Amino acid sequence: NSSLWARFCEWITSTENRLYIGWFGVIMIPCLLTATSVFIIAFIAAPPVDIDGIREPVSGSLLYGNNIITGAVIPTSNAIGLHFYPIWEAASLDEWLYNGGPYQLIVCHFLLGVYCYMGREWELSFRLGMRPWIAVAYSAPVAAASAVFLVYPIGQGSFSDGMPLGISGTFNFMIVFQAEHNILMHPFHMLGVAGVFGGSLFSAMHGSLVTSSLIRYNIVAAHGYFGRLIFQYASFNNSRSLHFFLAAWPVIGIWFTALGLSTMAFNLNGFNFNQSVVDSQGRVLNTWADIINRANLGMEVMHERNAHN
Amino acid sequence: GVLGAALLCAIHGATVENTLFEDGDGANTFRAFNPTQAEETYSMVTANRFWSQIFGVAFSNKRWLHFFMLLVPVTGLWMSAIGVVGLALNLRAYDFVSQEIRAAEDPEFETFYTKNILLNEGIRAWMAAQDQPHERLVFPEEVLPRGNAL
Amino acid sequence: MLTLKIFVYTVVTFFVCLFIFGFLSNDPARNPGKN
Amino acid sequence: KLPEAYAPFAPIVDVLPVIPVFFILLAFVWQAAVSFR
Amino acid sequence: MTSILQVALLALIFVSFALVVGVPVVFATPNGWTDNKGAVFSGLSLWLLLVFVVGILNSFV
Amino acid sequence: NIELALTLVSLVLVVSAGPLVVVLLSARGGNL
Amino acid sequence: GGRDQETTGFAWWSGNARLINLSGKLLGAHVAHAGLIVFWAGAMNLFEVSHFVPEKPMYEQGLILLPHIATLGYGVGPGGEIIDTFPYFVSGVLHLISSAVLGFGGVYHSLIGPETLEESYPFFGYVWKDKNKMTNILGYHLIMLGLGAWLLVWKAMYFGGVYDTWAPGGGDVRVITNPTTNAAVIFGYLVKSPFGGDGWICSVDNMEDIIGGHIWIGTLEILGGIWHIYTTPWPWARRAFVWSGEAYLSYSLGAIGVMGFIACCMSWFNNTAYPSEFYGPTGPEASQSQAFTFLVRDQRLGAGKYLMRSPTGEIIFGGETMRFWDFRGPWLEPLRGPNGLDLNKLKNDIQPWQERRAAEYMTHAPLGSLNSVGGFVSPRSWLACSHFCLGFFFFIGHLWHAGRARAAAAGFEKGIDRFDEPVLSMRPLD
Amino acid sequence: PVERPFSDILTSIRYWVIHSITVPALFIAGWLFVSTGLAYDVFGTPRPNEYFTEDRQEAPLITDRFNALEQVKKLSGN
Amino acid sequence: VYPIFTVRWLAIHGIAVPTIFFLGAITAMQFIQR
Amino acid sequence: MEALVYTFLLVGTLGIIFFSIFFRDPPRMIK
Amino acid sequence: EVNIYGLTATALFIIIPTSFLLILYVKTAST
Amino acid sequence: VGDVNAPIEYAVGAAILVSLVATAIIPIVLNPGQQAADKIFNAK
């Protein structure tokens, strides 16, 4: 009880700290702290990186003429591919900067930190008597982040295909998908959009009804309003089922969209309705899918450099 | 706003459903409730402490929480509407003139913003051919923008 | 840089050992419930 | 394309793979036969 | 001798269909398992023997 | 087009083979 | 018949949870599920055999089960050419008959068999809280797994061998005579990095190592089963885990999720346990073949072309394919020297069959679509995507079931007491 | 004056007698509507062989507001 | 309970009749050789 | 000059976040 | 000194609301 | 040109199947709602 190990265990496991630590805490704290430190330093004063591996460096640091919107941390070089490139493997620190190691450092440490945050959620929930199913809800954003940052590069074969840590980087990321894989027509992205929009709708409407009902009745009063507003009597008359539905809709939507991105990593595709309507004599009549395909074709042609010096 | 609304919905549902009071012998907690209940079905204190020890800040007022839920998406969509109203007059945020001048000065300076501008050029050039038939546009293949020519 | 490699390996091993010996020191029985 | 001796039995085979997804459905029907008790 | 194998196989298909529709009914209905054990066992034996004879016929085709 | 008709007939018979047991048990007062 | 919600406390959508403490019903359910699995196996095998054209390659017509039989060396000759399609029919029919038998057994144990098995059949009876019977079951099933591995070894070593894709002049059916049983080689893979260039477990490249590893796994599994059937957990083991059915379920869920992820990756990357001439070429193989064939065509026409240096200092093809510079294959190693490709061999050491294989691999890249229109979906993409999704879902299942099992063991799985809240017995202002 | 429950009508005889002979009439009416060729005439949708007129080999264009009726009549070939 | 031609009757029939008509139309459209 | 302004704004945001986390008024209304 | 008007706008937008809120907080905290 | 290949026999066959499956499930979906509306009504 008084052993140094016992004292350390009690301190780590104590719930009287302002922020609970736990063992998942002891793992995640250094990881996330290193990630954020390196992220800030690279965002502020990082030198150019050759993302494409054709000796055409891309500047993304603030000191090199950039704003908040246009700045980012460029992913690793295409030459490294999917290899492991730690700091002590590069010939010199300058070469390490030129190739783009800090992206790998950030992504690895951040992924470990988020997983251990997931674990710590359950740990604290268990230390207090709560039920343990908040980690399941948190799995959706964690799954999406893991997909985008780790599974897509593995499928494509290089870390240069990951999402740059920025804003304009994210926009370029989205545009390159819409050029290459036709994400907009993939059913899983449709389910993700539906999940997000339905979550916003349900949040707004639940807030409205609950605030209206609360008078200086919480569910038996507003239910009369809802049953006659848009019909649909006796749908969610149990206060627990309603909140479970709220927790379930967006989580399932995000799970499906993450699985869709993971499947695209192995490159099946979105839907493809090109030239799906033809009259007699074999002539082709254009549909909206053809206009979308023209936009995608222009996008893809613009992206590819092909002639690289 | 939209992403925060989804986040609030999910987190509130998960917290309420994972802090229910023991008022039912059955394994399922759905049937341990009736609409005519007097007290709330979940412990605010436990959830408040949990989220004050995990995240750092937690709600302590039901009315404020549900009002925040209402407030977020409405403001987000209103701001989006104002943005599209501005766009209707071709008042678009497109330039970042300093970056454009610097890029035009020397070719050897590339940011993701310039790549986005080039992608927009490609989209316009390759889609206007059939998107706007009334313009009667015929771009020869020589002039169509392509990455091979940069 | 071999010294940096050694330092990183030592730190990672220390933290991982701490974690493993943490969850193995009778985790399930330290709960607010009584059973 | 199957041994010739079993050539006429081609169509029935085309239905075998889809049988499992019916079993789950059957369960629901069975529950519907007891008022979802 | 493809015709004999084909007709035996059709008979096996019909017998298997009947056995599938019958066995769960015999099991589920109360006081039926001990009442109709002989029928179920006879059906199973016929099914196995017919499988074996179909196999031998295939070996001879 | 005998193949299509035979496939449809076999599929229909297979589909009906399942609910028949449930109907028989319900009608005969089984333990379903 | 079935239970009711009031008696058990589980709704219909959770009805199966009522089987936790009923041994016979659980046994019947498991047997029926195994019968269903083997039913699907046999039915799909027959369906694929019915729609099989021997002239065309297997990967051009969406077949995923026949390649598994072929890689064992059934009715296939050099170069992956099909000789006869009888063994696939035999396998499917046998699986279907076994399905019938298993389904009958499962239905009998589910509907008529005794509800509880530990009253009249003590040998097969068990209670989840016991720590001896469960270990005995574990040992039995470990012995079965070891016997299966040894069956694979026996087939590979005495029953005609398996299809080795690394033999000279393309692959062929060969009998592995001297599997590598060296401990260093076998256990070197387990400690290799999972990053590029290393290939933690997916880097196995020869059948010798595969057979040796299977020998080792079989021996270890049988030895561990013997150990478990004659032992009980140590006190630290008894203080480390939670002893309940749902805890075991969660452990299995996590393990199976990890296995699913590993299967996804190994299907996507490995090409020795998944020979190219049946599952088609991998994406790296497709790009490498495109570069190789373009170089050969340019050299032949006369009008290197694209050949650059690897960052470590070797020789690779240039262009967008420089990322896939770790690929190795039967049709490219003879052209590879000590440091990457050799210019002399790449110039005048190409045999016609290598060029034909590269040309074939050019147009069958994994590019496809869910609508399945074309760049045609390779089997590797389907396997990888499906098993990745299944592994992710089973990891979520591990999370859920482990959390619930631990909460139930603690004693607050159904909610806070509402009379003695632990939080109210703590200092304020956390 | 109480909006009879749906169960009462579900078990009624006149309800079924009316509907089992009425609904099929609507279904056949729709089938004949789109089979006889009335839909193309009514809604102006061209037939597969009427898309490209003899003198026109490209998508039409209205390019006129106050004479759009005559423009559309000429372009459609009617 | 007795009277018919109520608001509910009109509301249900208005969305029921065109639905059947359009279902028939689409089912017929399915069998066109193009 | 722009970089200094951006860094100052980000630092200010982080400082407000930290102060809210650590120097909040106690939630005694319901606890 | 680039875009002096922009710098003045940013400074005013950061100062005036901040000062207003801080004065309000100090005024009310006296209660 | 644009005529329907299938005859009217299938038209009636499908009409019978898609007309007596929708006129008997439209009241079963609304029954809960109509049963709960009266409970909500005449109460408050």
Ligand code: CLA
């Ligand atoms: C997971 C599978 C499983 C399990 C655990 C059981 C267990 C049981 N069954 Mg069930 N059964 C099964 C599958 C299973 N069965 C299947 C698939 C069928 C369909 C054929 C049946 C059909 C069936 C009937 C009809 C009956 C049972 C009965 C029984 C009970 C008594 C068994 C007995 O008499 O000992 C037999 C012991 C033996 C050793 C003989 C087994 C013969 C096998 C083929 C030889 C191999 C076994 C050997 C030990 C393994 C060697 C491994 C080696 C290679 C390393 C027992 C609870 C009886 C009962 O009491 O009802 C509940 C009964 O009447 N079972």
Ligand code: CLA
């Ligand atoms: C493969 C999945 C699977 C399996 C193996 C089982 C197995 C079982 N369930 Mg579970 N269940 C499942 C899915 C599954 N269930 C799902 C998805 C749901 C939700 C819809 C449920 C909901 C549920 C409830 C609510 C209950 C069960 C119960 C049971 C047990 C009694 C069997 C039964 O239905 O009562 C008997 C049913 C019948 C007699 C009617 C079905 C007639 C036959 C068996 C149909 C199949 C015949 C087959 C085609 C013939 C094969 C041919 C062969 C004989 C040669 C049994 C152990 C009960 C139990 O034991 O709980 C304590 C129970 O109360 N289940």
Ligand code: CLA
């Ligand atoms: C189906 C397989 C299986 C399962 C489920 C079990 C389950 C169990 N065994 Mg058995 N065992 C098996 C196979 C199996 N065993 C085989 C094949 C052998 C022969 C080699 C043994 C030999 C054996 C012995 C000798 C003992 C057990 C014990 C145990 C218990 C404790 C769990 C444990 O080993 O520590 C789980 C693991 C740890 C405690 C330490 C893990 C920490 C490391 C750092 C994690 C990383 C692993 C690895 C290094 C990472 C690299 C691999 C990665 C790439 C995947 C548990 C009941 C013990 C027991 O309770 O007494 C019977 C015991 O003394 N087993």
Ligand code: CLA
């Ligand atoms: C072999 C593995 C295994 C086993 C034996 C069990 C067994 C059990 N689980 Mg667990 N579970 C598993 C895997 C497993 N589960 C996995 C992988 C997940 C992650 C999704 C879960 C998530 C889960 C939850 C969240 C819950 C259970 C519950 C239960 C219990 C009731 C079964 C049930 O849900 O009713 C029968 C199930 C149904 C009627 C649902 C069928 C409809 C499904 C959802 C869709 C059909 C499949 C669909 C086509 C595929 C879509 C995905 C596709 C892209 C691949 C039972 C003890 C419940 C319980 O009470 O636990 C004590 C419960 O609340 N499980």
Ligand SMILES: CC(C)=CCC/C(C)=C/CC/C(C)=C/CC/C(C)=C/CC/C(C)=C/CC/C(C)=C/CC/C(C)=C/CC/C(C)=C/CC/C(C)=C/CC1=CC(=O)C(C)=C(C)C1=O
């Ligand atoms: C060098 C460096 C630092 C790099 C940084 C680079 C860089 C990119 C900087 C960031 C720039 C930046 C700030 C960009 C964002 C700018 C931006 C777009 C601003 C939008 C602002 C705006 C006015 C939008 C309008 C819509 C709007 C108001 C959105 C609000 C979003 C918002 C705050 C959402 C809520 C988020 C959130 C996490 C809520 C959780 C709430 C919570 C803890 C509840 C938990 C909880 C649940 C219960 O159920 C109960 C019961 C209790 C009790 C309880 O507690």
Ligand SMILES: CCCCCCCCCCCCCCCC(=O)OC[C@H](COP(=O)(O)OC[C@@H](O)CO)OC(=O)CCCCCCCCCCCCCCC
């Ligand atoms: C290990 C984990 C570490 C996590 C660290 C991060 C924690 C973030 C803390 C957010 C504090 C926000 C201010 C709350 C100020 C405050 O005191 O709020 C207090 C408030 C609770 O107030 P009460 O319920 O007591 O108020 C009742 C009312 O009636 C008024 O009395 O908290 C909330 O409502 C939820 C807040 C979520 C809002 C999240 C905003 C996130 C913004 C992130 C911005 C990042 C910018 C980055 C720039 C580079």
Ligand SMILES: CC1=C(/C=C/C(C)=C/C=C/C(C)=C/C=C/C=C(C)/C=C/C=C(C)/C=C/C2=C(C)CCCC2(C)C)C(C)(C)CCC1
């Ligand atoms: C058609 C064909 C043929 C033949 C066939 C045959 C002859 C078949 C048979 C089949 C069979 C004949 C099958 C069987 C099966 C069986 C099974 C599948 C069983 C199982 C069992 C089990 C599993 C058990 C278990 C147990 C016990 C009992 C006790 C102890 C414990 C345990 C659990 C172990 C020929 C060649 C001519 C041609 C080709 C194909």
Ligand SMILES: CC1=C(/C=C/C(C)=C/C=C/C(C)=C/C=C/C=C(C)/C=C/C=C(C)/C=C/C2=C(C)CCCC2(C)C)C(C)(C)CCC1
């Ligand atoms: C192959 C074959 C066989 C066998 C077979 C079998 C055994 C089968 C089974 C089958 C089955 C077993 C099936 C089942 C099916 C089922 C179904 C198909 C169902 C459906 C359902 C539904 C559709 C529902 C719906 C719903 C509900 C849920 C209720 C309410 C309303 C609703 C609408 C929502 C043999 C070898 C002998 C011989 C030869 C042939």
Ligand SMILES: CC1=C(/C=C/C(C)=C/C=C/C(C)=C/C=C/C=C(C)/C=C/C=C(C)/C=C/C2=C(C)CCCC2(C)C)C(C)(C)CCC1
């Ligand atoms: C309990 C129950 C359940 C389930 C169950 C199960 C899942 C069962 C299974 C069962 C099974 C899984 C059975 C099986 C059977 C089988 C059989 C019976 C077979 C037969 C075969 C045959 C007959 C063949 C024939 C042939 C061949 C060999 C090929 C070609 C030619 C021909 C077609 C002739 C549920 C959950 C739903 C619900 C509740 C009730």
Ligand SMILES: CC1=C(/C=C/C(C)=C/C=C/C(C)=C/C=C/C=C(C)/C=C/C=C(C)/C=C/C2=C(C)CCCC2(C)C)C(C)(C)CCC1
């Ligand atoms: C076939 C193969 C091979 C080999 C293989 C082998 C040799 C394997 C082994 C394997 C193994 C040998 C495995 C193992 C595993 C293990 C594991 C996976 C473990 C885990 C554990 C855990 C997870 C734990 C946990 C925990 C916690 C954290 C809580 C507290 C306590 C404890 C510690 C319990 C070769 C290359 C030749 C060929 C090819 C492939």
Ligand SMILES: CC1=C(C)C(=O)C(CC[C@](C)(O)CCC[C@H](C)CCC[C@H](C)CCCC(C)C)=C(C)C1=O
């Ligand atoms: C007791 C009683 C009830 C309850 C009743 O509904 C009726 C029928 C009135 C009416 C035909 O619905 C009149 C509908 C005409 C309506 C005023 C037209 C304008 C409003 C809407 C367009 C009606 C349709 C709304 C529906 C779609 C929800 C009579 C005659 C009764 O005696």
Ligand SMILES: [Fe+2]
């Ligand atoms: Fe709420």
